[PDB]
Amino acid sequence: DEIIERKKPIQKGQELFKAGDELKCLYAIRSGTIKSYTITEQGDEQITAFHLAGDLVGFDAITEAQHPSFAQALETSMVCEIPYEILDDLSGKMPKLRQQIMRLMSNEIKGDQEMILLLSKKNAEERLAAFLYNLSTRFHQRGFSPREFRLTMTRGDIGNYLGLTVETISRLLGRFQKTEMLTVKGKYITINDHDALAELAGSAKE
Amino acid sequence: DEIIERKKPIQKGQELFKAGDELKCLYAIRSGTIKSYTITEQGDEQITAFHLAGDLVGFDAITEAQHPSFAQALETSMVCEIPYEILDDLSGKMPKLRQQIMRLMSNEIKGDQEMILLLSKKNAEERLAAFLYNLSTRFHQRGFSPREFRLTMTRGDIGNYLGLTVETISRLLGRFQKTEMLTVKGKYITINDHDALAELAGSAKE
Numbered sequence: 001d002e003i004i005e006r007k008k009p010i011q012k013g014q015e016l017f018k019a020g021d022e023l024k025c026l027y028a029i030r031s032g033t034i035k036s037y038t039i040t041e042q043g044d045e046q047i048t049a050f051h052l053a054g055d056l057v058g059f060d061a062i063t064e065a066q067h068p069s070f071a072q073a074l075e076t077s078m079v080c081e082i083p084y085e086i087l088d089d090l091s092g093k094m095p096k097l098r099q100q101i102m103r104l105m106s107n108e109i110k111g112d113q114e115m116i117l118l119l120s121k122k123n124a125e126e127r128l129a130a131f132l133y134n135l136s137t138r139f140h141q142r143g144f145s146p147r148e149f150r151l152t153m154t155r156g157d158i159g160n161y162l163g164l165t166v167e168t169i170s171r172l173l174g175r176f177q178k179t180e181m182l183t184v185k186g187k188y189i190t191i192n193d194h195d196a197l198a199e200l201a202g203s204a205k206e
Numbered sequence: 207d208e209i210i211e212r213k214k215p216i217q218k219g220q221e222l223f224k225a226g227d228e229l230k231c232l233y234a235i236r237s238g239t240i241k242s243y244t245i246t247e248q249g250d251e252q253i254t255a256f257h258l259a260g261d262l263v264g265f266d267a268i269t270e271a272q273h274p275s276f277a278q279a280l281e282t283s284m285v286c287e288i289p290y291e292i293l294d295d296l297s298g299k300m301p302k303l304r305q306q307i308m309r310l311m312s313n314e315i316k317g318d319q320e321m322i323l324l325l326s327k328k329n330a331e332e333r334l335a336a337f338l339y340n341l342s343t344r345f346h347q348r349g350f351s352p353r354e355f356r357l358t359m360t361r362g363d364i365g366n367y368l369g370l371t372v373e374t375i376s377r378l379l380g381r382f383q384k385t386e387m388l389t390v391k392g393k394y395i396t397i398n399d400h401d402a403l404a405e406l407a408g409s410a411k412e
């Protein structure tokens with residue numbers, strides 16, 4: 001009867017919600033970048049995922065109508081916030097919509113499962129490769145140059161997420177640059193050899 | 207019009223499906239235990255999750271109508287296999303059903319996110335504690351003695367999943383037994399101090 005695509009101006013640094021917040025809205029990334037993290041008892045930040053354009057945020061909060069995690073813009077971002085009730089209401093009416101919602105949640109499970117394997121079996125070189133490959137192909141997927149993209153998150157955040165040093169991360173980028181596999185200019189990454197990167201990415205060797 | 211709860215006798219050791227298999231059916235655990243794993247390029251097993259009674263299996267396969275992972279019974283198990291089409295068809299008709307399906311997938315994301323934090327921030331003592339606590343409360347949740355439960359998976363599989371040695375795992379159980387926090391008899395675990403375990407579980411300290 002009346003669809004609305006009201007978009008919202010989320011500046012860098014600010015939270016979509018907090019860990020404990022009641023699930024009012026799910027948030028759809030129309031543009032920009034969100035990170036999801038949690039704070040440990042000891043008080044440290046641990047990032048559990050990164051969200052890009054197209055991605056929906058808060059799936060982990062449905063079960064208990066409560067956000068178990070923080071979200072935060074890593075840059076200026078545009079969001080469409082949906083009251084869950086409305087969503088489920090509309091996806092009950094619309095097949096190819098929920099079929100997509102299922103598909104999107106499905107994909108977040110697949111991802112975390114991959115992230116679990118990564119943290120289990122993969123070495124530092126493999127993790128960064130797997131990370132850059134993933135980023136790269138979600139861009140290419142969404143519609144971007146599969147070879148040039150910008151790292152929106154810090155190198156710190158990448159290390160946090162992959163369980164690696166900022167030192168380590170920058171050394172690795174040097175290696176990838178030295179091999180011509182990759183071109184790095186500040187936050188911009190150019191892939192010159194997707195093959196080689198994919199190899200490195202999907203290894204998991206001792 | 208016609209609901210069917212046809213159940214299936216899955217013996218220990220056999221696969222529900224393989225990595226690459228086309229999503230014909232989702233599988234609902236009426237009884238028993240399933241593990242989901244993947245095989246690395248190098249050929250090793252890495253478990254990404256454990257499924258119990260109540261849990262649905264194959265959510266990670268919806269996005270691409272393809273199973274990205276293996277499943278396998280860890281013991282004799284009873285399953286209800288659902289053609290995805292039917293599921294989505296019925297959940298389009300039935301609100302509180304999909305509302306549950308969303309809830310169940312939501313919960314698998316939350317879990318893996320936790321599993322990600324675990325593998326990132328938690329030490330060996332914390333991981334096992336977090337693992338036993340989780341198991342414990344899913345039992346209590348489903349309806350079981352929140353204090354006595356059986357480890358259906360091997361100690362090997364637990365180590366695989368938590369990135370710990372079988373040696374390490376058995377030493378830890380000794381510690382937990384020594385402190386009276388826990389009672390261990392073969393595969394049977396008795397929780398004597400949920401508090402202490404929960405503490406250990408939800409720590410994530412250096």
Ligand code: FES
Pocket residue numbers: 005028029030079080
């Ligand atoms: S307006 Fe279509 S996704 Fe934000």
Ligand code: FES
Pocket residue numbers: 211234235236285286
């Ligand atoms: S029969 Fe109800 S879940 Fe298997």
